[PDB]
Chain length 386, copies 4
């Protein structure tokens, strides 16, 4: 069962299934894929759409006539399959010119180039129908303390994002930006290393409403953080504009395993949260089929991303709908967590002897939270052991 | 040399030098210290002041007459020594009533109690002259996914901080709040786990100007993050209201080693940043003399916190003042990082062929950043090997 | 379903369900349990037996008559319930005398005391029928580099274990030792930090056959290691004498969550390995019911340890027995991994042109490993989604 | 000062200074270096020698005549400069044929090829004068649990190392092997992930005396382990055959920073240990000049490796020779740690009432260890602040 269809809004980057398998220590294990072929194969699996960096769709340094032909062929594949392009992004990390950054490169000429490269691809993104434009500043950061003054770098990063906001406003485009945090890799430390840092930065932009976050499962887990909690804070802020789904085993290099691999229970709680909250954006996979795999394994790994999401969706929904779980949630006071602490106001709280002078602290301390029974019901639902 | 004096603004929590050595696996190794004795010993070492949780100064459950006598004795010790009290905080973590949180406990009665307990100690803090009131929500969080809906918890945390802001405004107090992030420990995951998450949260409070952060070296390092970078983002935001200095060896339990221990180069870059930026708040140590130590070792460890700060301050200042370093900084384009990317404006950037059509990407890529020579000058200055 | 019975050989430490909830930052949340009550409650749940540190069964400093009465009551509870005592251990970590270690304390008198304390409890262990005597040297290590010369400490640790081996041989006891590694906590770094380090150390003891390892899920995961892989190396070495089962979320303080919590897929692969290998020792839980819980939650958490093991056992067995999985294992060459590389011998390998001169490296490189399809069959079996 | 000369025995891999800067997310930033040029430049800096993988010296797939000419040119550069070749190794990780391993590949034909490739280069290593032959099994491991049975893989790894030992014995070569552990990267988990695991494995080889370890600073730190402690255990075992020096910031991708970068205090304690122990092998750097650098920065980074070792050597020697430190070491009972616990024997210990019945546990517990004063003397010596 668990068959995806385009209604499920699953999307994939061209660079995911198209990854040829080069790693720090290894040459490619697979031939390059034509984007047309990836669009056709992903549609066959039941994907809704694809995403791209500029340089995945149009080789870097292409002439205008080559650019036009690459876009024409890609548009034909989209039209042949019904696939969409909900998101696009810029490659500001592969070319050696970006070795110290794009928007926060120490060289000013590089910063200006990075902005022009981005702007060119925003126009293309809009042409192809994208609603979201991601920015992963993977080269923004440092290996050493003197190399990068972070206050100056944040000034440059704000100028860049503000210019991009002025550009989209000037053109009357509806597209919005999603900043993707990552704590490290390829830089020793990356600027805006977590969802929190990116959310905080956005509040200092001139038009914050144009910007949200694009969190990635594995990135927050590279800092040992709880990905569902970070997603909850992004949702609380109204800033979950896009999301990248994959798997990661804790604090390592970025593994980009298929979704559901890595921390399975975190995957369960993530799906539970997205579905509970009614997140309506793409469920995008930013993953890499391991380099051990041939093309059959690439498509199996892609299919597994979607299958795992659908299994988890079923189990999370069954958990929340189970009367026994609903009673356990009330036994654990989840209902009381959702009630205001002091809707009666400050002065009433100050005058309330039940809140201090007559609060029986020992009686309250003795009341168990019943969280372990609740969590074992969650385990039983995930495992199909009810 | 490197002798601290009160002008250096070094402060210590009562709970630091007063830690009796109990850990997850171990009983106390030292007798309790009277706060009067810690104030006298810290003053002898050249400290400027001390800080307290409510329950470090006044045992939990004290009568009004006991409270008054504890405060009277402490005030006498302050007056005898010239020590100040720049910061105070609430213990919302030790008593079993707070096992699921204070401000975000699932039990509403506990949330209301936590607020009353905090308010009582804000009044005391102001009496004692404190400018900053720290809040470390160490119990806010979860060990399991169903136990805590994070959006609801953030709603409760905002209500609590907003009520506290209304309280201080109503009283005409000048005190400001500093929220202390930590990623985990004692909860499996703590809410507001990093500086970024706390900065982002503050922007959603009703009176954000009343709130900043109190980052701790070891807390950000428990997420593998770069503490100087996070401090730079807090400074960029205008939110470094207080800071906690200590040492930590990476991703472990919170070690609370003396400042300078743990990541020494991060300590160097931190001091460089605080001094460069002209941070004018207390240099507060939140550390624990290891439980291996007797009282002589407690005071040696405290003295070492201050000594290490002063050594690092000298070395960072020598680095920045060295003409050879100044030339290396220009060779690495730190000066260009500090210049606006496009003060000429968006349309000029769009019309600038030097930024795209005529940008020689290969020439720019070939220019080395010279960061390793710069970093070895920094190493040589730190080690006194110039 | 998934009901444990004593035949399943599930065991629990007295200190697990008996943990009162004290943590670095918190007082006890539960009253102390009488060991008699824990034996009765665990038997009711279907446990096979219990384990103890000396000081969990007999309070430290007890008189001979108090000792005798504590043991008499415990033996009655064992006899009333049919519970066994397969393992015992020494507390060489709680009392302040052990603040720098037991066997590797810098103070020689402490080292000698630690040995006498251990020997006294080996005699008790044997009286109670234990086959395995665990040693977790949680205080062996350092917070600073000068405090502990590790070569000298390893000399002292070998002398201690050798003396213990001489003691058991002298008495004609059948009991064997199991050394429990942990990388850190409560010491900044603990000696013998992983399964590998402990296995290597054992090979240098005078009677290595008397010693094996007692790995704990969460301990190896505190170093980011793969617990099933480490168990496989222990099994390969013939040294898995005992095992501690629990849950952990990666690189943090030691969480001691119930088994199945933390890394669920690692729990699956662990059970698969133990069952495949025919491990016949106790399935022992070294866990802590979270301090949020009352006693009902303690017993629910304990029951969940056993339930999760039994669910995982069923799913792992179904995976290995599924003809589709068996075919996927052959497609991924797991059968070839189990065949000798060169049973033909060195000279034949050297003369084999198919191994070098005529090896078609490109054809071999092109053959996919089919690991993603295999892993998604494993996921489907774990989740009950076949 | 701190000028290295060949007497210092500093060595570098060709792949270190020759790294062109390709990373997971980035193309090369530097042109390829001819090994002849690296030998000349390293000699100019005061290096003693160089090391190589087969494929760094002779491009993969070279003809016999190309092989001979590459070796001839390299030998001329060695002879021109006086540089040595103390160590060599095999590249069993870059070519796609090794995507599942060399010695533990699931495909048997690949395992046999990996052995022939290694044997060919052992002969070359011996020709060039190498004493040590390193093996880093970077592809040995898995991303998923079903893909690799670790007991079977360890059987294959033992067969491979045993065959290599039979080969060197058959040829009468004096060369010995050094196994290099790493916990992860490029595989999700690597087999023999730490020094301990490798030491334990070696004890099960047929001729253990032929094998030791080649630990790398950053590899053990990728597991959060204490590198000096692991080196001490290797020295204790008599197995430190070679060492790789670099820098790493904790639990991340393998950074390969220059030695002294990353954890500076760990670098200090490492040098202290190597020098104290009289380690006489090469001080080999396995590092990567950051891709931000041009060739001038490559040579500056290489020079900094050696400079930092020499600074640390001076400071560690001054620490150990300082009478004040010597007295602090006795105050902390480091002398007592080095004395046998019970040279009087088991029966005397059992009969010694001072070890149990008459041991004043409270008096011993009250004696402070004085470790913080000792560690601040170590800090002061490292920083040149005495
Ligand atoms: Co990623
Ligand atoms: Co991504
Ligand atoms: Co802390
Ligand atoms: Co703090
Ligand atoms: Co544990
Ligand atoms: Co244990
Ligand atoms: Co490395
Ligand atoms: Co290496």
């Amino acid at each position: 069962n668990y068959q995806p269809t385009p209604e499920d809004r699953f999307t994939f980057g061209l660079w995911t299934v198209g990854w040829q398998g080069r790693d720090p220590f290894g040459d490619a294990t697979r031939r390059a894929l034509d984007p047309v072929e990836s669009v056709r194969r992903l549609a066959e699996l039941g994907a809704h759409g694809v995403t791209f960096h500029d340089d995945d769709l149009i080789p870097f340094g292409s002439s205008d006539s080559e650019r036009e032909e690459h876009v024409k062929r890609f548009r034909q594949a989209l039209d042949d399959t019904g696939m969409k392009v909900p998101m696009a992004t810029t490659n500001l990390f592969t070319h050696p010119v970006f070795k110290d950054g794009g928007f926060t490169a120490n060289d000013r000429d590089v910063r200006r180039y990075a902005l022009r490269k981005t702007i060119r691809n925003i126009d293309l993104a809009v042409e192809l129908g994208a609603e979201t434009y991601v920015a992963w500043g993977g080269r923004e950061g440092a290996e050493s303390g003197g190399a990068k003054d972070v206050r100056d770098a944040l000034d440059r990063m704000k100028e860049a994002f503000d210019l991009l906001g002025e550009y989209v406003t000037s053109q009357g485009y509806d597209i919005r930006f999603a900043i993707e945090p990552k704590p490290n890799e390829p830089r020793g430390d990356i600027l805006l290393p977590t969802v929190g840092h990116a959310l905080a930065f956005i509040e200092r932009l001139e038009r914050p409403e144009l910007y949200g976050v694009n969190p990635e499962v594995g990135h927050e887990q590279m800092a040992g953080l709880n990905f569902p909690h970070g997603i909850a804070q992004a949702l609380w802020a109204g800033k979950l504009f896009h999301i990248d789904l994959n798997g990661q085993n804790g604090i390592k290099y970025d593994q980009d395993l298929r979704f559901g691999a890595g921390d399975l229970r975190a995957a369960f709680w993530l799906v539970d949260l997205l579905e509970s909250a009614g997140y309506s954006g793409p469920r995008h996979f930013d993953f890499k089929p391991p380099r051990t795999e041939d093309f059959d394994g690439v498509w199996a790994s892609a299919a597994g991303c979607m299958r795992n999401y659908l299994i988890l969706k079923e189990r999370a929904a069954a958990f929340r709908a189970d009367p026994e779980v609903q009673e356990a949630l009330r036994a654990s006071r989840l209902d009381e967590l959702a009630r205001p602490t002091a809707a009666d106001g400050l002065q009433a709280l100050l005058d309330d002897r039940s809140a201090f002078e007559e609060f029986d602290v020992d009686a309250a301390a003795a009341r168990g939270m019943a969280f372990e029974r609740l969590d074992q019901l969650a385990m039983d639902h995930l495992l199909g052991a009810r």
